[PDB]
Amino acid sequence: EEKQILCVGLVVLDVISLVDKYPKEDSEIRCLSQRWQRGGNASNSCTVLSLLGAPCAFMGSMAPGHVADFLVADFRRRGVDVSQVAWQSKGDTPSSCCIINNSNGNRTIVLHDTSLPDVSATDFEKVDLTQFKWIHIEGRNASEQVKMLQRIDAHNTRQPPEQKIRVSVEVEKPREELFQLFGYGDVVFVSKDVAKHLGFQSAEEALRGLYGRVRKGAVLVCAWAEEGADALGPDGKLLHSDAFPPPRVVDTLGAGDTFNASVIFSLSQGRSVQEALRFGCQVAGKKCGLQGFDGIV
Template sequence: MMSLLCTYRCLSQRWQRGGNASNSCTVLSLLGAPCAFMGSLSAGPVANFIMADFSQRDIDVSAVVLQVEGQTPCACCVVCPSTGTRTVILSDTNLPDVTAEDFSKVHLHQFKWIHWEGRNAEEQVKMIQQVERYNSMLPQQQKITISVEIEKTREPLYQLFPHGDVVFVSKDVARDFGFESAEAALKGLYSRVKQGAILICAWAEKGADALGPDGVIIHSDAFPPESLVDTLGAGDTFNAAVIYTLSKGGSLQDALTFGCRVAGRKCGFHGYDSISKVFDDMQPQSLF
């Protein structure tokens, strides 16, 4: 549920599907990439709304796990129209997360890229290992790319660092390790990722940096809109745009810049749907 506030009066309200991986799927779909979502839901009106919204955006939900226990979590997001900032009040529930056993039922041959939002990391490592075993039987050009997002400052999530071909680490996590810039975080945390991996850290209005196996720091400035309207999901938008570009064979610099451009544009309007309207003039030329 979204509440748009000016001072203390609510000016408008809407329902919006959320969640990091869910939002990234929305953006990928709007950019024209076929994608699927896997997560947990509990049957009821909230789940019905979520599933209908996925369907409206042509996002495959055949792998969604309907749990018999728990409730689908809901958040109230208060957005300030004068600054575009948001306050999130989360009503978290006892809804079980997807397990490695659930993931074992997924037909991996459908996918070229699988992204994990860091949650129940111990189970997610087991899921990733399933993909790694699958990849070991394939030629290089057919292997599934694995990406992980480590956003929350929770110690168990840090075991995901060595399991991604592409690793997104948040500003909050970087600061939790004592780093005060994206560049410092990449240099300090790169030893945690596996050989050949790409480590990416976005730093809000300062843009984003990335570090690959060549040891060269890549940077993109931020592209703020003329006026901030809605920053909710900007990070999820950035991740999706980076994944989109890299999956199309774009360079790391192109991916980083495109991610910052799309995320910046998204902050200039409510929700995500307008991304498709401004996509053509933002797409990296190297992808044509």
Template sequence: MLQTHAQCCRCSVHPVPSWAPCQLVLWPNFQKYCIDVSLLSEHPQCFLPASMVISNTSTGSRTILHMNSFIMADFSQRDIDVSAVVLQVEGQTPCACCVVCPSTGTRTVILSDTNLPDVTAEDFSKVHLHQFKWIHWEGRNAEEQVKMIQQVERYNSMLPQQQKITISVEIEKTREPLYQLFPHGDVVFVSKDVARDFGFESAEAALKGLYSRVKQGAILICAWAEKGADALGPDGVIIHSDAFPPESLVDTLGAGDTFNAAVIYTLSKGGSLQDALTFGCRVAGRKCGFHGYDSISKVFDDMQPQSLF
């Protein structure tokens, strides 16, 4: 039996986790799970419970889940180093609920974006840069991120070429302040939405039209969903990879992130731009064929570019 007597708010939306088939998740039927929800409507001023107690009625044992502890546990389970993460003393943890349609694989994200501060350039200055080979920025608070990148550029200026940190940025959202990141990446990922915001209707057209915004010698990459992805480097040659859709579309959540990660992985290992683009499309396509990300490296072992070995 699961009991929660913590103070929380009434929930009028019955979302479906992205990792679970819709037909298996029956949140409206609280009695099915013996969940005591008698206090749900008594404390509308509160946001989330501080903790939840899961009790085993047959043994009397219990497990206490403290709010947000699952986040750190998730990182630890997947061997993600969070030693440089800034722990905030103000604000609340943002929460996003992803509703996935099993028949099409499309998703709707319901975001509760609270007042958690973004990482600042001052926070970043406390990080020891010598431990990094590649640093990637997803465009958010761009003015602060430019200051962070400038710290890396100053650090790089004192190093030989082979020891310099590679800088990549992703410009995904159609927000004008993010566009100042274009000239600050050695590798720049631009989204289909941003390309369309500039009036381009294909990845190739976007690369040709936006390349003047990146710095000399940079690589510009644009993924275009089912049409694959294109890249343009300093040699002026457009490189293309087709998409690799799964047999059955299950969950597209995170496909763009897995594409970026696979491209960065390949380039950081010395792979060619063509290999990186193709591997990125393969990984993103395979990702869309199953829920979640667990054991993703095992799934993709057979797809790594042979040139990396």
């Protein structure tokens, strides 16, 4: 069953300026280039998933408008299905103002989340789970997403072992409400930002420190930028892959999303956790030498 991979989360219009040096206050500078790029964690993962060759679908809140039309068009050009999008009656699809330093790949994100209602459990209740082999959830509205996770669980209990839906979750924002999401999913992604916010100084210590929160049987993954990525499963052994830096790092916008999608892809292809860590570091690393995601395969 090579069904689709469903990613649930944010879609964002990223307005991107590429500069030599980060601008100072009240200054006026001319940019190297500018672009609009579809963004949002779950949305970027769909881009990378479809570039890796996997049929995938995005599910997130969008509002009808010019921004949405651009985003929907871009989704469809990547081959990312949007039939599960939760269209709202009023509002604006979120957007960000992004500055990318070209000399080191740093990225400044000024985000506008638009009081747009999040994907609700009632929205997710309508999804036909039989279309997906893997469902990835970007931690967002935790109380509602738990019910989605519970719905997937009840479905899985009634399926034969080979037709159970694999589940991954990302806890990327250091917000207390999201931490309960650690206890769901077969694969849990914890951000370096969340690890540090929680007092850890390395992926390894974060993995050892946090593993008692995950569902028994789950794999906890913590990427650490230039120091590579680490994972920890039920057998208690810490796994690690080094980073694979490109010659010049020019754009780290969405680099964590590339890692996440690559790990999801690798595991969904039957690879082992060690293999998935290495592939994730490789694809994310070479994204960092590119503007955007084209050229990552």
